[PDB]
């Protein structure tokens, strides 16, 4: 079973913070409450590798009272004055912690972008379904509605807008369970089969999520799991089929650690491989079975974000609508809020911090 695996092979450590220390922890170790709320234009620090090393060397010359992907990821604080990043970003109304991104550039080379806010509509308007189009799509069965909605859909400071990888910052907490599926497959796969296989991914993974987070009312019907499939509704995708599954951390919990989230991912992996439905629905297509790169949660490592290509599969949503969902317009709309697909986002009394699994 899975109870057995999370009875022997995982050792939870949680620390119930409480009262004001809870708010302090949330504000301190997650992105600021406006880092991921949309904005008319970006205030950030975007340049190539070399120009970023220079601009760091120039912000060091104004940060003399103490002390490139560790250092950008390091530059966080606030105090009651502007934060220390403001020497690099060059505004005074920046707020921290704030995202740091790795940007592949044509033809080669890497750029980084620490930004206090961005225009998330410019990124996700050519993927957003109008509230009316949803509300008129009229299609009762949730496999049916999810599949039809999926059918509908449609310079460094410019290259950030087609390739953008998010850098894990182990200083920060984790409020979302960002899984990185890399299903390799021998014969191609239709899309209704994949969509139902994902309906069976969510159910097993939510059972695993509920075992790992015991004091959480994670109803395996309405709990949101957000799926993004890389474009390659015909699948047309041979060799490899890249998914991305993002789940909110359940209510009172937050996760701390690279090893803690490596453990969470591996438990979800074994739980979905222990669901007999999933490996029927998806087997005989799938060569290997390692569906989850649990080593992507290491500090300094990057995951391509939804709505970004590769240097070109835009990770675009596959609405695996919850069984017994409640407000379908809102579930569709959340595939666009950046808070639902960054590691260290603000959570949406006490909290418990799962800082170890073993």
């Amino acid at each position: 079973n899975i109870g057995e695996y999370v009875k022997h092979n995982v050792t939870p450590r949680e620390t119930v913070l409480d009262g004001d220390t809870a708010k302090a922890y949330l504000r301190a170790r997650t992105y600021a409450p406006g880092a991921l709320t949309p904005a008319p234009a970006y205030c950030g620090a975007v340049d190539s590798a070399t120009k970023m090393m220079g601009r760091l060397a120039d912000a060091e010359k104004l940060l003399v009272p103490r002390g490139r992907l560790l250092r950008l990821a390091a530059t966080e604080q606030q105090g009651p004055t502007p934060p220390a990043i403001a020497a690099l970003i060059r505004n005074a109304a920046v707020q921290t912690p704030l995202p740091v991104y790795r940007i592949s550039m044509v033809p080669t080379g890497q750029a980084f972008a620490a930004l206090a806010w961005d225009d998330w509509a410019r990124i996700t308007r050519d993927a957003r379904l109008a509230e009316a189009v949803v509300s008129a799509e009229a299609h009762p069965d949730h496999g049916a509605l999810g599949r039809r909605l999926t059918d509908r859909i449609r310079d460094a400071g410019g290259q950030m807008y087609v390739n953008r990888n998010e850098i894990f910052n182990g200083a920060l907490a984790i409020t979302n369970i960002i899984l990185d599926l890399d299903i390799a497959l021998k014969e191609p796969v239709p899309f209704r089969r994949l969509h139902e296989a994902l309906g069976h991914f969510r159910r097993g993974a939510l059972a695993a999520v509920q075992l790992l987070f015991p004091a959480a009312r994670v109803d395996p019907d309405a709990y949101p799991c957000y799926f993004f499939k890389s474009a390659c509704p015909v699948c047309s995708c041979t060799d490899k089929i890249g998914l991305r599954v993002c789940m909110p951390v359940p209510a009172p919990y937050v996760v701390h650690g690279s090893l803690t989230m490596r453990g969470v991912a591996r438990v979800i992996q074994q739980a979905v491989l222990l669901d007999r439905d999933f490996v029927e629905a998806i087997g005989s297509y799938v060569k290997n079975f390692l569906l989850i790169d649990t080593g992507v949660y290491a500090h300094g490592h990057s995951l391509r974000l939804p709505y970004f290509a590769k240097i070109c599969g835009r990770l675009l949503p596959v609405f695996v609508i919850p069984p017994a969902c409640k407000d379908v317009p809102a579930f569709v709309a959340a595939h666009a809020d950046p808070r639902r697909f960054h590691f260290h986002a603000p959570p949406t009394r006490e909290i418990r911090v799962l800082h170890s699994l073993g």
Binding site: R13, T15, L17, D20, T21, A24, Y25, A28, L63, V64, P65, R66, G67, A74, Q77, Q78, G79, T81, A84, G170, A171, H256, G257, V353, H355, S356
Partner: protein
């Protein structure tokens, strides 16, 4: 030989020369004398000092090396840094020659002043009668921007790895005097008139005539074959300054000197001393004027510094332990006092070694249950004993320094400035002579063996201490009732009278009769180290904790937590429930420390110049005029160390290493808690707090 009834305000060294001779030198001293009305006048005295007296106040150097400190009369402005004890020596020896040749001399006190009109020099001084002139005070605020190159200020610490940076700052200002020439300076001397002064560069452009009076007096010193004229600055309507940039004052007074002493006449000394003038600093602040200006600068209440000035003739703390008696005349008094003691006490004085078990005490770790604990003390017994024994050995060496000591002893119980001076002088004279270490050890041993012997008979049982401070359990009281004040009173009287009787029986005579303080009545106590003891009163929830380090604000919050935790823990009258209370206290402490995870000044510890510490960032070497406030303590956070005071405010820091600091604090709290658990409940289990396992993540 005219006598004027007056009141000397300051005594300061003007010149130091050697006559057509080889083995002695003279000095010329400057007197700031004031009439009954306050009307200032300026007199002088001449003194001679031999080679031997100099070596005595130095503790062997040579008088040609204390007359080539007549290079201080130029613009080479920080000559004491070259050899500080030489100046402490020269000034103490002049103040001894002056009382030994001119007679008793007392700042601010009514006096009788002679002269010699053929020469104008004061020849004799005596006491007198009259309601003297109140010392008026002048306020001083001064700031300066010396441009020291912060790569030269790092070479010094390259040579002297523990060097306080006020010293490196002064040493640079010594290696390039011109840094004080081109230096902004602002001064605002309020005198009840007003003296502000812009100085964009201090070598370029209220009245300096309503603040000082420039006086020229003609003198015929025996040391000179010529009449020589002394030019001075006589303060008007003020007698001292109250204020700290030591280089600011140095460069200000150096400008005043270069200006006043421009034309042909005689040039004063210009020497200053302070803790900034030693490489390793010195705990207490002071700015000793012993030269040009002519009057002090109390770098702070202020009645304290004023009275200390007046009592010790102004040489304290400038000269050090030389106030009381020369360094190399302490072995004689040590031996002589040793001889006068009763031979049992003398065998004690001769086999004292610092780590000895004289009284049987509660062996740590151990606790005392519901009893009637009392904690006593003899206020300042080491100072009283040093004074008394110096008297009793007096015939081994004059006694004017010992009279200063005796004034400080009779004044300590009622004035705290005297207590401060004693607490700083008794250690430092023992440091100047170890046979004093041993004499004090022996007499304190005798004073402990009594107290033990008397406690045998007064229903008291000494449980710990040293003999000037001790505590114990009245193991006869009924653990209850109002017949406990009576027994503690009887015990305090018995021990006071017995210790007094013992000290007499050895011919040690105390300035003022011993008082045995009762510093608290308690009902529980736990002891976990030699110095670590916590006390608690169950009747009224009052306590005392001693032995915990207080190295910063984090440690005072921690000590409060340890005290509240021990109150609950001893309110349980098993061990496991105690451990629950202890880990609950540590949990709540780490969380509330998280709320202050940004407050750098809170996590900063103070590190002495002796305890090896974090190295300096080169970025701290250009903290400008804040390095000049670093004379003793360095306040450091941490992983890389930050001297939080060598940087302007507010700081801009990576996260403070709260795990490192909480680890330190938890180690000390764990000493306390292991002590209490072992002592009260007999657990062999060292208390340990899981930090790396729970609560480490909060600071990762």
């Amino acid at each position: 030989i005219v006598w004027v009834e007056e009141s000397v305000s300051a005594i300061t060294l003007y010149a130091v020369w050697l006559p057509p001779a080889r083995e002695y030198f003279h000095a010329l001293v400057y007197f700031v004398c004031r009439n009954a009305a306050g009307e200032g006048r300026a007199r002088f005295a001449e003194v001679s000092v031999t080679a031997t007296e100099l070596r005595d106040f130095y503790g062997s150097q040579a008088v040609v090396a204390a007359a080539r400190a007549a290079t201080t009369p130029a613009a080479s402005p920080l000559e004491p840094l070259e050899n500080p004890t030489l100046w402490r020596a020269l000034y103490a020896c002049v103040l001894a020659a002056l009382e030994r040749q001119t007679g008793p001399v007392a700042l601010f006190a009514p006096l009788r002043i002679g002269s010699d009109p053929r020469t104008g020099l004061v020849v004799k001084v005596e006491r007198a009668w009259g309601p003297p002139a109140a010392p008026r005070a002048a306020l001083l605020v001064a700031e300066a921007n010396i441009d020291i190159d912060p790569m030269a200020l790092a070479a010094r610490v390259a040579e002297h790895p523990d060097a306080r940076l006020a010293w490196a700052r002064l040493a640079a200002i010594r290696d390039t005097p011109q840094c004080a020439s081109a230096a902004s300076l602002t001064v605002n001397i309020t005198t009840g008139a007003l003296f502000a002064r812009e100085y964009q560069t201090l070598a370029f452009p209220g009245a300096f005539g309503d603040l000082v009076e420039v006086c020229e007096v003609g003198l015929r010193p025996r040391g000179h074959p010529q009449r020589v004229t002394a030019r001075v600055l006589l303060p008007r309507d003020y007698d001292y300054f109250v204020s700290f940039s030591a280089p600011a004052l140095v460069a200000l007074f150096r400008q005043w000197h270069t200006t006043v002493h421009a034309a042909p006449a005689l040039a004063p000394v210009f020497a200053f001393l302070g803790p900034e003038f030693e490489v390793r600093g010195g705990p207490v602040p002071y700015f000793a004027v012993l030269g040009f200006p002519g009057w002090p600068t109390f770098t702070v209440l202020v009645r304290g510094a004023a009275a200390a000035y007046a009592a010790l003739l102004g040489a304290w703390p400038a000269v050090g332990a030389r106030v009381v008696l020369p360094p190399r005349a302490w072995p004689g008094v040590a031996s002589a006092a040793a001889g006068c003691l009763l031979p049992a006490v003398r065998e004690a004085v001769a086999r004292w070694h610092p780590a000895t078990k004289i009284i049987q005490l509660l062996d740590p770790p151990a606790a005392v249950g519901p009893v009637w604990t009392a904690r006593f003390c003899f206020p300042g017994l080491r100072a009283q004993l040093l004074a008394a024994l110096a008297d009793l050995g007096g015939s081994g060496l004059g006694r004017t320094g010992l009279a200063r000591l005796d004034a400080l002893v009779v004044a300590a119980p009622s004035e705290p400035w005297a207590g401060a001076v004693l607490e700083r002088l008794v250690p430092d004279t023992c440091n100047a002579c170890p046979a004093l270490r041993q004499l004090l050890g022996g007499v304190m041993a005798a004073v402990c063996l009594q107290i033990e012997e008397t406690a045998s008979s007064v229903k008291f049982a000494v449980c710990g201490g040293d003999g000037g401070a001790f505590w114990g359990v009245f193991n006869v009281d009924p653990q209850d009732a109002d017949a406990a004040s009576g027994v503690i009173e009887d015990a305090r009287r018995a021990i006071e009278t017995a210790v007094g009787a013992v000290l007499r029986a050895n011919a040690v005579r105390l300035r003022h009769p011993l008082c045995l303080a009762l510093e608290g009545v308690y009902t529980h106590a736990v002891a976990w180290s030699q110095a670590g003891v916590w006390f608690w009163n169950s009747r009224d929830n009052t306590d005392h904790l001693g032995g915990f380090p207080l190295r910063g604000p984090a440690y005072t919050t921690a000590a409060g937590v340890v005290r509240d935790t021990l109150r609950r823990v001893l309110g349980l009258t098993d061990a496991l429930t105690a451990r629950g209370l202890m880990e609950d206290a540590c949990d709540r402490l780490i969380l509330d420390a998280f709320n202050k995870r940004l407050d750098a000044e809170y996590w900063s510890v103070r590190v002495s110049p002796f305890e090896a510490s974090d190295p300096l960032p080169p970025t701290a070497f250009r903290g400008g005029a804040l390095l000049d406030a670093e004379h003793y303590w360095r306040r450091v956070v941490r992983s890389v160390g930050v001297p939080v005071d060598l940087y302007p405010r507010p700081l801009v820091l990576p996260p403070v290493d709260c795990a490192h600091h909480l680890r330190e604090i938890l180690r000390e709290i764990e000493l306390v808690f292991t002590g209490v658990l072992a002592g009260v409940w007999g657990e062999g289990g060292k208390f340990v707090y899981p930090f790396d396992d729970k609560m480490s993540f909060l600071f990762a």
